[PDB]
Design a protein around this motif. Structure first.
Motif, PDB file in Angstrom:
ATOM      1  N   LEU A   1       0.633   7.244  -0.899  1.00 62.07           N
ATOM      2  CA  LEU A   1       0.983   8.572  -1.365  1.00 62.07           C
ATOM      3  C   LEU A   1       1.125   8.576  -2.878  1.00 62.07           C
ATOM      4  O   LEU A   1       1.903   7.799  -3.440  1.00 62.07           O
ATOM      5  CB  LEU A   1       2.291   9.025  -0.713  1.00 62.07           C
TER       6      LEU A   1
ATOM      7  N   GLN B   1       1.162   5.816   3.998  1.00 66.48           N
ATOM      8  CA  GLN B   1       2.400   6.217   3.335  1.00 66.48           C
ATOM      9  C   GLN B   1       2.495   5.577   1.958  1.00 66.48           C
ATOM     10  O   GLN B   1       2.770   6.253   0.960  1.00 66.48           O
ATOM     11  CB  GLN B   1       3.608   5.831   4.192  1.00 66.48           C
TER      12      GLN B   1
ATOM     13  N   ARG C   1      -3.637  10.724  -1.489  1.00 66.33           N
ATOM     14  CA  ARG C   1      -3.368   9.337  -1.150  1.00 66.33           C
ATOM     15  C   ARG C   1      -4.465   8.495  -1.783  1.00 66.33           C
ATOM     16  O   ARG C   1      -5.647   8.768  -1.573  1.00 66.33           O
ATOM     17  CB  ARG C   1      -3.324   9.134   0.363  1.00 66.33           C
TER      18      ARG C   1
HETATM   19 CL   LIG Z   1       3.607  10.250   3.789  1.00 65.86          CL
END
Ligand SMILES: [Cl-]
Length: 242
Positions: free
Chosen positions: A173, A170, A183
Motif C-alpha cells: 500500500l 497490504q 499498491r
Molecule cells: Cl490494505
C-alpha cells in the motif's frame, strides 16, 4: 493486445530522461506502452524484488506476520531510516535492504530458486550471492514481466498461500484517497549499468484495475522522484487518476 503510444515519450523527454511506462487495463485485457522494445528489455529488479522476497519469506515462515519486528543490527548505514527496527510494512516502505538480505539468507538458495521458478519471475536466475543477487547478481526482469507477475499477485494466483499474498499486498500500500488506491514498489538499481529506477504496481479504481511498470535511466539519485511523477503524468493523461 499491446499498443504503442509514443506520445508518452514526451513525459520522459521533457525531463531529459529515457524510459518506459507499461500500462495494463485489466477489464479490457489491453496493454499500452511508449516503447515496445524497452518494455521487453530485462533489468536488475533491485528493490522491486522485495515483492517476491516478502512472499517467499512469509510462505516459508521466515516472517511470521507483518508485525514481527526485525531489530536493527546496530550497524550505522548511510540511509537514516534503515538504522532502526522494522516490520514487514516499514521495511517495504523504506526499502530496507539489510532486512531483506537476512530474509534471503534464511530462505536459502535452493528454496529461493524453486520459488522464483514457481512464480515465473523474470529470468528466474539467482546466480550471485544469495543475499544480494537482486542488486548485483544474475536475475533480470522486464516491465512486461513485472506486469505478468503483479497480475497473478492481485488475483491470489501465485503458488503461495492466499494469506502470504494478502499480507504482501497490504505491505505494498502506497497511496489511497477517495479516488484511487495505489499498491506498488519502487526500485533503484545502481550496481550494474545502466543505472535505473523502477516503479511497479497497480491502481485500484471503483470498477477497474490498471497495472503499471515503469523504469527509467537514473544516472544520479537526484531524479528518483521522477519514477512516480512521470507515471502519474501518464495516469493523469489517460484519465485513470484525476
Ligand atoms: Cl490494505
Amino acid at each position: 493486445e499491446w499498443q504503442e503510444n509514443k506520445s508518452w515519450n514526451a513525459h520522459f523527454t521533457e525531463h531529459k530522461s529515457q524510459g518506459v511506462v507499461v500500462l495494463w487495463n485489466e477489464n479490457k485485457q489491453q496493454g499500452f506502452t511508449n516503447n515496445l522494445k524497452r518494455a521487453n528489455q530485462a533489468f536488475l529488479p533491485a528493490s522491486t524484488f522485495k515483492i517476491p522476497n516478502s512472499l517467499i519469506a512469509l510462505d516459508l515462515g521466515v516472517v511470521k506476520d507483518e508485525h514481527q519486528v526485525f531489530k536493527w543490527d546496530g550497524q550505522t548505514r548511510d540511509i537514516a531510516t534503515w538504522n532502526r527496527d522494522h516490520n514487514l510494512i516499514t521495511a517495504m516502505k523504506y526499502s530496507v535492504v539489510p532486512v531483506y538480505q537476512e530474509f534471503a539468507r534464511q530462505i536459502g538458495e535452493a528454496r529461493m530458486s524453486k520459488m522464483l521458478h514457481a512464480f515465473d519471475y523474470g529470468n528466474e536466475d539467482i546466480s550471485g550471492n544469495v543475499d544480494s543477487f537482486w542488486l548485483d547478481g544474475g536475475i533480470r526482469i522486464s516491465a512486461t514481466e513485472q506486469i505478468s507477475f503483479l497480475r497473478k499477485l492481485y488475483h491470489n494466483k501465485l503458488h503461495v498461500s492466499e494469506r502470504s499474498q494478502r499480507i504482501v499486498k497490504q505491505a505494498m500500500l502506497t497511496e489511497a484517497n477517495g479516488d484511487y488506491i495505489i499498491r506498488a514498489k519502487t526500485g533503484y538499481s545502481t550496481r550494474i549499468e545502466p543505472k535505473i529506477g523502477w516503479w511497479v504496481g497497480w491502481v485500484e479504481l471503483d470498477d477497474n484495475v490498471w497495472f503499471f511498470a515503469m523504469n527509467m535511466d537514473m544516472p544520479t539519485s537526484d531524479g528518483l522522484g521522477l519514477r512516480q511523477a512521470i507515471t502519474k503524468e501518464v495516469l493523469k493523461q489517460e484519465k485513470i487518476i484525476p
